[PDB]
């Protein structure tokens, strides 16, 4: 009744992949493992041994079921005065997504259909969620404080 962790990258989950696994008991044998589109953490593939699919951490995206989250690290200036976010896609395109209104700390903007394939309807994808991280200045001179007091509301 034996489990071993099968680590799968976001890209593997987006497109599917085949994974080959070596064993010894004492004959060296190969178990092959089709990983179909959009399969979730925990998914069990058993072998008369139980491979349990784990999401490999990715540094651009955080998986949220079939959705994919994108941290957008912008300046406070960008957040107050406007900016363009070049959203990366899982297949390596970039989408400019223009923001005219004030962006708020932790604000989300759904980029529809740029997520993972939903396992059972893999022609239907989840979403890419922009998640804004507004980076404050470490320090503000007395010069700036005095202007900021005049132009920002009480």
């Amino acid at each position: 009744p034996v489990t071993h962790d099968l680590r799968v990258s976001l890209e593997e989950i987006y497109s599917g992949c085949t994974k080959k696994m070596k064993i010894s008991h004492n004959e060296d044998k190969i178990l092959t493992i089709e990983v179909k589109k959009g399969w979730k953490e925990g998914t069990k593939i058993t072998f008369p041994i139980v491979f349990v699919l784990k999401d490999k951490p990715h540094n651009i995206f955080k998986r949220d079921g079939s959705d994919v989250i994108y941290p957008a690290r912008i300046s406070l200036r960008e957040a107050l005065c406007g900016c363009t976010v070049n959203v990366p896609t899982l297949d390596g395109r970039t989408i400019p997504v223009v923001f005219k209104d004030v962006i708020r700390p932790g604000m989300r903007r759904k980029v529809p259909g740029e997520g993972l394939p939903l396992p059972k309807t893999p022609e239907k994808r989840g979403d890419l969620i922009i998640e804004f991280e507004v980076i404050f200045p470490e320090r503000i001179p007395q010069t700036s404080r005095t202007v900021l007091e005049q132009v920002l509301p009480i």
Partner: peptide, 27 residues
């Protein structure tokens, strides 16, 4: 029971062994 991931390349070479072993034991 020792398990470990293989590359496409590693995996081929290792079948050529369980094969080129089931060759000797098929004698």
């Amino acid at each position: 029971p020792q398990i470990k991931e293989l590359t496409d390349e590693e995996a081929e070479r290792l079948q050529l062994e369980i094969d080129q072993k089931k060759d000797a034991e098929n004698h």
